[PDB]
Amino acid sequence: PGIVELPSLEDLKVQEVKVSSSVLKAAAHHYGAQCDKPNKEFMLCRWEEKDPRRCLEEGKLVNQCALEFFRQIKRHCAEPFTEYWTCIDYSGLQLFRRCRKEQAQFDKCVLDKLGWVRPDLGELSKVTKVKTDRPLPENPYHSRARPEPNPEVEGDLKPARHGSRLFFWTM
Amino acid sequence: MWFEVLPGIAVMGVCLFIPGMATARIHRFSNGGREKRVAHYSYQWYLMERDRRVSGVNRYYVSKGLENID
Ligand SMILES: CCCCCCCCCCCCCCCCCC(=O)OC[C@H](COP(=O)([O-])OC[C@H](O)COP(=O)([O-])OC[C@H](COC(=O)CCCCCCCCCCCCCCCCC)OC(=O)CCCCCCCCCCCCCCCCC)OC(=O)CCCCCCCCCCCCCCCCC
């Protein structure tokens, strides 16, 4: 069959978010609140196109919007964020409940210096609507033509001509 | 009297104390002064392997914070 089309290695170069998972988990709710729109544009494009190769640029926007998220933490609130993700980082399951006072200090410093409200219980799991300018994929499965069905039954049912027609039976 | 049985109970209790203290201290020694990462589910293992790749030194427990970005 045909040749698969891989993008170049230059099309895969982006400035990586080189932080650990406890840094991401400590900043997760404010990341979902602030970096909402390009993340949801990317995931809409990702569930609609069903191809990562059709989703690179929006993905780069995700990797563009995460970094601007962290710099805006790193400029203003590096101390409560560091003290909070260290405590998140201690736990082997990375519990939020072990770290509520560092969470409260990080939320206080962020709400004072940046005005970000942490999302309540239920908010980040909502199904949201996304207004994009890319087109809807008309054939996302790349399906070819389907076979035509067999012709249906039509016409009023007349009796059997001369019955069963079984060898000598007249009905 | 009944406190004559307490040396054997003390020896057996120290021997029961040893494995949990040992695994706690060995987990903190082998994982950067912290608990061992618990990966029961594939998302936790995914984040753990991401940590092992973003640390640069092939160790998930080497944490990287805001200093690793500009
Ligand atoms: C106003 C509203 C009301 C109006 C009412 C109008 C009517 C008034 C009268 C009321 C009564 C009507 C009766 C039914 C209509 C006539 C049917 C008829 O004669 O068909 C002839 C039928 C076909 O001949 P035909 O000349 O081409 O057709 C004449 C008509 O057009 C036949 O018409 P058809 O072409 O439309 O027939 C359709 C088709 C015509 O047939 C075919 O297309 C060919 C296939 C027929 C079957 C062949 C099977 C062969 C292998 C098995 C053989 C078995 C052993 C033979 C018997 C051993 C002893 C029991 O029939 C069948 O396929 C059905 C099978 C045969 C049943 C006939 C009726 C039996 C009722 C009483 C049963 C009593 C026992 C009878 C003996 C048991 C065996 C039947 O003759 C045979 O098959 C030969 C065997 C005789 C059959 C039975 C005759 C009925 C009278 C029996 C009285 C004596 C009983 C003695 C005691 C018991 C036995 C010891």
Question: Structure solved using which method?
Answer: cryo-EM
Choosing among A15, A17, A20, A88, which should be mutated to test the B contact, i.e. which has the most B CBs within 10 A? A20
Count how many domains chain B has. Answer: 1
By the 8 A CB rule, do A48 and A130 touch? no
| Nearest-neighbour CA in chain A from B24: distance (Å) | 12
Q: What is the resolution of this structure in A?
A: 2.7
Sign, CA dihedral A110-A116-A121-A125, equals negative
- CA-derived radius of gyration, chain A: 29
Residue with tokens 């993700």: A85
**Enclosing domain of residue B59:** 1-70
In one-letter notation, the amino acid at residue A30 is H
CA distance A44 to A79: 35
Total number of residues shown for chain B: 70
CB contact under 8 A, B66 and A73: yes
Secondary element (H or E) of residue B54: helix B42-54
| Closest C-alpha to A92, from B64, B7, B11, B30 | B30
In this structure, the residues whose C-beta lies within 6 A of any atom of ligand 1 are A 168-171
